[PDB]
Amino acid sequence: PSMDIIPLNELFSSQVENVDWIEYVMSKIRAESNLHSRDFILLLLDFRNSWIDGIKLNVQFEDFTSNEYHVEASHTSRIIVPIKKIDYKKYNFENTPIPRIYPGRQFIQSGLNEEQTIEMRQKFWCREHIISKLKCNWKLTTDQSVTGSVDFNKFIEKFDHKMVYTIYPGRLFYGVQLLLDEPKVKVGEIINLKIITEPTSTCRRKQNSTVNFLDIVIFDSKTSKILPRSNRRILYNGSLTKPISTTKVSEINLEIIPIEKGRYEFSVCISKSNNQDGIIQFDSENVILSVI
Amino acid sequence: ELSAPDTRNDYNIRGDYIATTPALITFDGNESFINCYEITANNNFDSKDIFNLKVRYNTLKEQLDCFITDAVLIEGDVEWFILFEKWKTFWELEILKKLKYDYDAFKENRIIRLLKTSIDLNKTKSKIRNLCIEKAVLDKILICLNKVSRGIAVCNTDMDEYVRNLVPKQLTVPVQLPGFEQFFHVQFEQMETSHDALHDTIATIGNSLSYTVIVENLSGQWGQDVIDDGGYIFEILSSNEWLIHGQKRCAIKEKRKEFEVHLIPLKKGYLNFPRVEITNIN
Amino acid sequence: LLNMRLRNISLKSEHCILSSLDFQTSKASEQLTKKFIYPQEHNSFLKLNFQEISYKLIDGTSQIELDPICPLKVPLTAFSYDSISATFKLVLLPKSTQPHRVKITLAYELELHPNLKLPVRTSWETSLVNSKLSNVKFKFINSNIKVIKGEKFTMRLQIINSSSSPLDLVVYYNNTINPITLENQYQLHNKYRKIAEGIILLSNDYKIPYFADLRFIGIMSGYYGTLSGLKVLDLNTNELIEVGNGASVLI
């Protein structure tokens, strides 16, 4: 009787690799050596028992396995499954499925009809993707062999707006990777940084400013980003604002002339304009480099 | 471009900025455009010469109206054969009072007049009459630069044909001081509360004065404050300066002010006055 | 009037009180004897500190400063040793003695002996989270102690009630980015993103009915000071009060 979805950022380590989901994501990422994280989001189910004995609670999503999740009498327990998030460059998701009573009533939509009619379509189609694989099998604790399932279509409520862009990239605007030369540069050396941006199908709401202003912000990999005047820390050519199109895969550059450092971090944001409160999204792509 | 001076220095500069991926790297008088230059020193120490910058700037106010001139009202080479030619200086007495929208040219809205005087200006056809591909077809192009303002119409495509290349070239001082020495303080932290995970800012200095001083500040802590008393122990090498600290307290107004108003001072052994401090809390 | 001395005391509330005296060279006295020293062809002074001691002023007591000290002698300098006091509860201003022994010097003889002692009071003087309604005090039974390694761990919110309806309330973590000078927008966004996404709280709406265990897992690194998000909520309208307490490095 609740639901929450949380992304993932830490690669993790081998000595803690004994709980099921981290060894699942690590084992899945031993091959396919382009992804590391930020693509293996993690959804938080919370099973609650309204009965009078323990149950054992497996869950299998796709090839995910579980432990012997011993639940108790009236005890809520939280069960953690990892999913690769729904890519909109493997699909399109602009289809309403008609129900099973073809009564031909042919009703209205009655909102901003290009926005909510496909927005709630995005909601219950991502709910269709979550429902259509998630499988549980439960047996009562040493007093039966009652091995049944537990259906979910009376349980998963809707998706709120956090639980759309957490599950579905393509709710927010630009897909961004960050292509770098080396992570292990010495001090006196010059590095081209190369972000690569992908404008989306869901830029169709505006089209007005084809130009859209980004930023590049540099974090210390503790906290507390360096200022524009990055004195004795990092050096660069020109103002970092460096526009992109809402047309195609634009590229951009800087020249991170490093000086007297270690363990930096680079990430962007999207600002649409020059003014304050123009900023509309903050990406989370955080490529770190070290300086020796 | 920053380059060599007029001596036989041959300094191994490697930093530069040519606009190589754009040709139009804009600027709008509120942001930075920081340009950085690595001037690595040659076979000797770096001297005190005068270097020279080379900036090939241009104002925006000639660039933006080329699509308002060579595209909007000079399309056909017969419609711009004689219509422009006998009134080019009349066009340059017309477009010089354009007063374009350089107050909202940050976000969008390039190539718009900002409504200085739009309606009274069309009386110029009366007292002087010329070819109607200019005298009657450019008032529509004056409306086409009044409305129809494109946010970014790829303005580097129609730039290089008419943009003049101004070139300021200022000096560059390499301004500095002259006293080279060194230091190396060593330290070992004494427990206060718990280790807070200390992080380093830096270690370098440059100074020359009369009754000269060299002040230093400690590292940066990112746990709970009033932190561990750093106990320090000197190796004040290669000189004889004057110490002023012993076993400070690392999140406070204490400062290991190793002053130097004294002798044993070599001169000009590097790019400036330098004394590589390099404190070590290990 | 040869070496100006000052004592600075800082009140570390989670430990003892720390007070450090500080010697200096007193420049308005150094140029005095510098004039006669360069009259006798000497560049700087050679005062020798041979017996420096802080004693706890009482009927009779003495202490020992919190690191090591040799018998030193410096020309134009400053030194500062630190000694730990005892953090008083309320209203007892302790006093100290702070004796010293500067030995001056001349041409291998004529060591004019000096001594000084400035006795004064060592009181400069500039984690329970109360409920702020009915003294339902919360304290973690191991606060600020956790070196986890992205493993599970358990804590202990020892709630202390009025023992008058002691079964009332529910904890929760609120994994949601709060909705908030442009880099003042970005620092608040990075703080609110790393708060609401780094740890999970495996017992979410635990509904406590007076210990708790509260197992977390913690999926990103970094020092999480003050551990925000971990709210409780109680029988009245909105007792949405924080814990504001406890911290964990996760590496």
From Swiss-Prot, chain A:
Location(s) in or outside the cell: Golgi apparatus, cis-Golgi network
Subunit record text: Part of the multisubunit TRAPP (transport protein particle) II complex composed of BET3, BET5, TRS20, TRS23, TRS31, TRS33, TRS65, TRS120 and TRS130. Interacts directly with TRS65.
Family to which this protein belongs: Belongs to the TRS120 family.
Other remarks on this protein: Present with 259 molecules/cell in log phase SD medium.
Protein role: Specific subunit of the TRAPP II complex, a highly conserved vesicle tethering complex that functions in the late Golgi as a guanine nucleotide exchanger (GEF) for the Golgi YPT1 GTPase. TRS120 plays a role in the YPT GEF activity of TRAPP II in concert with the two other TRAPP II-specific subunits TRS65 and TRS130.
Protein name: Trafficking protein particle complex II-specific subunit 120
Annotated organism of origin: Saccharomyces cerevisiae (strain ATCC 204508 / S288c)
From Swiss-Prot, chain B:
Entry protein name: Trafficking protein particle complex II-specific subunit 130
Cellular localisation: Golgi apparatus
Subunit structure: Part of the multisubunit TRAPP (transport protein particle) II complex composed of BET3, BET5, TRS20, TRS23, TRS31, TRS33, TRS65, TRS120 and TRS130. Interacts with YPT31 and YPT32.
Primary location: Golgi
Source superkingdom: Eukaryota
Organism: Saccharomyces cerevisiae (strain ATCC 204508 / S288c) (Baker's yeast)
Functional description taken from the UniProt entry: Specific subunit of the TRAPP II complex, a highly conserved vesicle tethering complex that functions in the late Golgi as a guanine nucleotide exchange factor (GEF) for the Golgi YPT1 GTPase. TRS130 plays a role in the YPT GEF activity of TRAPP II in concert with the two other TRAPP II-specific subunits TRS65 and TRS120. Required for both the cytoplasm-to-vacuole targeting (Cvt) pathway and starvation-induced autophagy through its role in ATG8 and ATG9 trafficking.
Coiled-coil intervals: none
One Gene Ontology cellular component: trans-Golgi network
GO biological process, one term: intra-Golgi vesicle-mediated transport
Record-stated family: Belongs to the TMEM1 family.
Keywords: Autophagy, Golgi apparatus, Transport
Other noteworthy facts: Present with 432 molecules/cell in log phase SD medium.
Curated annotation (Swiss-Prot), chain C:
Subcellular location: Cytoplasm; Golgi apparatus, cis-Golgi network
Gene Ontology CC annotation, any one: cytosol
Chief location of this protein within or outside the cell: cytoplasm
Highest taxon of source: Eukaryota
One GO term of the biological process aspect: cell wall organization
Keywords: Cell wall biogenesis/degradation, Cytoplasm, Golgi apparatus, Phosphoprotein, Transport
Biological role: Specific subunit of the TRAPP II complex, a highly conserved vesicle tethering complex that functions in the late Golgi as a guanine nucleotide exchanger (GEF) for the Golgi YPT1 GTPase. TRS65 plays a role in the YPT GEF activity of TRAPP II in concert with the two other TRAPP II-specific subunits TRS120 and TRS130. Involved in cell wall (1-->6)-beta-glucan synthesis.
Binding partners and assembly: Part of the multisubunit TRAPP (transport protein particle) II complex composed of BET3, BET5, TRS20, TRS23, TRS31, TRS33, TRS65, TRS120 and TRS130. Interacts directly with TRS120 and TRS130.
Miscellaneous comment: Present with 1660 molecules/cell in log phase SD medium.
Name of the featured protein: Trafficking protein particle complex II-specific subunit 65
Source species of the chain: Saccharomyces cerevisiae (strain ATCC 204508 / S288c)
Organism ancestry: Eukaryota, Fungi, Dikarya, Ascomycota, Saccharomycotina
Entire-sequence positions represented here: 212 to 559 of 560
